Amino acid sequence: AARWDLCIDQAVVFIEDAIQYRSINHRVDASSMWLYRRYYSNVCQRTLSFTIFLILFLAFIETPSSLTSTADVRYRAAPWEPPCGLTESVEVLCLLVFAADLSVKGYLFGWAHFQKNLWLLGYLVVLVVSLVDWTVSLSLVCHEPLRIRRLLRPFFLLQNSSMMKKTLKCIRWSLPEMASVGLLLAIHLCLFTMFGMLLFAGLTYFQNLPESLTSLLVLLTTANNPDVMIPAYSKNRAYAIFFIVFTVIGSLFLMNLLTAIIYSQFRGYLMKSLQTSLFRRRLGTRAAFEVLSSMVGAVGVKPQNLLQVLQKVQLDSSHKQAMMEKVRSYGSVLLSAEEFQKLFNELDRSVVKEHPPRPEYQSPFLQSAQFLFGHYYFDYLGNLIALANLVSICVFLVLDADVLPAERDDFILGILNCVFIVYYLLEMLLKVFALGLRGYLSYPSNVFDGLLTVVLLVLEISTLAVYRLSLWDMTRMLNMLIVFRFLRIIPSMKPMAVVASTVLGLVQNMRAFGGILVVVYYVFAIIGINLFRGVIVALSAPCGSFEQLEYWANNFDDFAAALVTLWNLMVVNNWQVFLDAYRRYSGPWSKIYFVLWWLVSSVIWVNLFLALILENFLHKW
Amino acid sequence: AARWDLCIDQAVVFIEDAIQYRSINHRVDASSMWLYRRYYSNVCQRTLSFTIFLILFLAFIETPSSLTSTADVRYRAAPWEPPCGLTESVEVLCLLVFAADLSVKGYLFGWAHFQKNLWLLGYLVVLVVSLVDWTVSLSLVCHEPLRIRRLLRPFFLLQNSSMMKKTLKCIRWSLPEMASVGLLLAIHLCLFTMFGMLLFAGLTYFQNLPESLTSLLVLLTTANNPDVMIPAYSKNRAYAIFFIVFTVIGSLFLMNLLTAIIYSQFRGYLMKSLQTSLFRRRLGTRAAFEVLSSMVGAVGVKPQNLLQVLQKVQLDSSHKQAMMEKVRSYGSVLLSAEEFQKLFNELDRSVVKEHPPRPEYQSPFLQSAQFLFGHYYFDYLGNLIALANLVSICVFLVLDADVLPAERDDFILGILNCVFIVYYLLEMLLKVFALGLRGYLSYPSNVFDGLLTVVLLVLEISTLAVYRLSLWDMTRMLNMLIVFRFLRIIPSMKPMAVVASTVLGLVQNMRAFGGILVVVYYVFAIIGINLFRGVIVALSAPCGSFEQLEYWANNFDDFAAALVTLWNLMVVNNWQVFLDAYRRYSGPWSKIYFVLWWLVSSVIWVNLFLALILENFLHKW
Ligand SMILES: CCCCCCCC(=O)OC[C@H](COP(=O)(O)O[C@@H]1[C@H](O)[C@H](OP(=O)(O)O)[C@@H](O)[C@H](OP(=O)(O)O)[C@H]1O)OC(=O)CCCCCCC
């Protein structure tokens, strides 16, 4: 009766959790299965991810207000400051929907699970501190300059995903060894700065403790490699040995040793993911069987209740129909535990179709089309005119560049661009009138060249409507999107398939890695605005300074300028110049900030990138 | 009779080849076993390696003659040019002993093996071309400037070793994939140099084909990261996207993909070495058994002939005595094939002894010494005064540096250096008078601190003989060797043993890796002297040039200046400056040379270094 219905909804939600690899640790009530099935629907989780993007996007429209044409200090516009309430309004709107997500996730799980899970307790702590800071910053009329509630904003991105949580555990185990290597690195610097100060000061670089300690720190990342040993190596040829040995021990041996420590915890990363996901699938279907054999009742289940329980799940139609036809043909005998676990192993095959074409009225007309459609060179006739188009844009690009840069002939360019895009629209039209509209949507390559033929047709016709033959600007935009045709050649990779397999493997596994990149940049940019906001002003410089080189755009005035400044220090080149600038402008203790950014970003994250490419290249072979 | 003796020498040379892991593919004659046993002796192979060092050392004393105080062009001495015949004389002396090595190695092996082995045929080819060039360069009175016979000199280093031959096979298999990645790299540069020339020229960097192609090539290795995008990013904030995407695809994705290709052929490198070496050992002892069972004869061998054949081999005395005592106790029954192969498995254990101490005459005196010798803190009392010594040298180093740099007090430094080295000589003396002279030689740490106490005693006493208390120079040399005492602290590594295990693993496996490094530097330096020998002369510069920065010491005038110039391009920093200098001074086509040096050294060899550290870190766990 009522227990009959409740075991159905118990067994629907268990199979649905066995497809999408979720654990079974939630309470089972009457109404809770409606709440659980609606919360894990894709329409509810998409607004949750859209919120997390909206929270992190608001740092572009805050009070420093990175909405400017440029980011120089010598010449830029006024900062558009918003009114008092709008950025406060959107933030408390999204902080409401984060409270709703926690309250649903606490209701669906146990209180004993709620007190033990550290991620849920940290979620409640961050929500109340962000709300306290919101009321404080609104009790004043938007006049608290530094807001702590923006620092906790990357925590919502971490708590939503699971691949970020797995990778942070992998860095947690590597930290006992990387500390010991960094200790050996600190011994390395302090010994050679005392050996250096005895040897040379007895330079421009070796004259003090903090000046000599910086010079060997910057040489450790080889940012001034010939510069730091010009005055030594010009006095005697033997002082080259001192700087050669420092960067063989330092940059070669110990920085590459630090990569291999991080790889040694990511060494079996993907195979643990398949073993855990298969273990979650087998536990889901077993719990579905064990509640279905105990409906009204040898051991086993009735297949009539199986037809009532595979009806109301979300699954592919090909997987739904093939599974239902197997169990329809099976008899009324009870299905054992082993027969149940083999039944749900039709979730391993993948089904692909493209489409069939449509028949025309004139039978010789459709015959002449399809015979001359399946040539396997009709596309290569498209590829021949594609290569012919790209070589023409290049060969005129060297012609218009060097000589007569003001006013050029530009006669035959419009002719070739006429005949090439006319050929593209015909190949667009002949393929749909052979296959069909749904058949042309079936191939993902054909969407790319079909859309590009459209946009090239709009820009060409508008070019031929203004003139007959800003003229240079329209031929600029026309030539730039023509070079996108060369991204049809690269989808033809027959011999070198390991490279194309790898780039497919990386982009499907960038949810974890980009998540840690975003969290690291978001914290360090926001600290940097609070420390170096207006410390660079401008109104015969030394030839290697921050001012001779016109580095005025690398400041921390707002959030967009901070992200590009922090990028230029991540690649380590010329970061001696940034250290010398902020030492002069914002005191001597600012070097703690740039050295910490070198550790978190350049050392750990780049070696975290190489470890992930090593694992995704070495998979199944 | 005579066949009795010949089977003995057959079975001596097979067991000796089964210890030192050499194959059995050589002919067996009467006199040839004397030749083979004398050629593989360590006194014959050491002069062969000393010759190979002597051939490669002669490039320092050749006609460019790198014997100068400095290597500037603004001020350096005259080149000491040697007479006509001496470098020719030493070369033909070593070319004689290479002919003797080939002739022995061809006599000991088969002619059919000689015609099939490619290394032996290349050996004969290089020897005759080096001899033809020697007679040609001596028919003129040392006036052929460029000598081809120096280019073939790294081939003798490759042919001698076997770890270099194994690693060159591993690079041979990776070359089909690295070419495909470099193709994808070349597509990457040519697309964005045409996209760049449309976008910006419609800069200082984007105005031509060869100027724009260099700018994106140098950005690929991030040698001008803020410099190439100053004028774009100052005009508009959106042009940062063009340069961010180029170095995410370029330097991040594709250069780290090129590491993982090389690692995928070194992935099982050391385990193949143990499996091949154990296979060479089992084949050696089996061939020893099969010729010993067929001396005069169920199956088996007589142990009396075993005592005659284990007598005349070279082996450790501990392994010799333990093996002989096992077979002495075994009876006169014939030893089977399985019993033979288990007999030679006492080459797996390793035996360590240090020494016993010696007794003194007064029994309470020796009792008081040894009781207060085994404290485990007598060494730490040495370690406490070691740390006390090193902190004192440091704390005065900041005191003498900053203020009053001309003439300093320098009063208490001689006092502390007196009492510390006096303590060291006593700890030197009390340990030998407790253990012994042979007991003090037993510990390799004690040789290091014992020798350092000696040299510190000579320099201190000579310091106290000139003065009472060049004075600053002697306190410089005294302070510098005192800092070597800190290399006693680092031999105490209890928690972080994986780091110390790895550095032990690297240095025992640097025969292969340094061999390819030496071969690469030797060829590219010698080509560079022949191309850019006198193209840099010197007699208001742009602020980022080769002349504003005083880079005058990075030339190719002789062999020592070439090696440091090629080093400064291996680390990729500021190599835009070198490209701009040699373009102005030695034509436009010189960039082919520096780009090829970027590929061989920076790309392949550094990734060859990371692959080897990855394999030696991941071994037995
Ligand atoms: C600098 C690096 C320092 C490392 C610090 C990070 C320490 C860290 O994450 O370990 C995990 C622990 C324990 O929490 P933890 O259990 O590790 O969190 C993960 C989730 O439980 C996940 O469940 P779902 O996502 O629902 O599937 C589960 O699969 C993973 O197990 P697995 O390994 O088998 O995949 C867990 O690793 O969680 C904290 O204690 C952080 C709490 C506050 C978060 C602050 C982080 C900013």
Ligand SMILES: CCCCCCCC(=O)OC[C@H](COP(=O)(O)O[C@@H]1[C@H](O)[C@H](OP(=O)(O)O)[C@@H](O)[C@H](OP(=O)(O)O)[C@H]1O)OC(=O)CCCCCCC
């Ligand atoms: C840029 C890289 C290009 C790669 C070019 C290098 C090509 C290359 O070495 O392959 C090996 C072949 C064949 O020669 P190869 O047999 O490979 O040479 C090795 C020796 O035979 C070695 O014997 P021992 O040293 O006496 O113990 C044996 O153990 C190795 O087998 P293993 O793999 O099982 O360890 C062999 O790899 O030898 C050549 O054909 C070069 C002849 C002229 C040398 C010119 C080299 C400058």
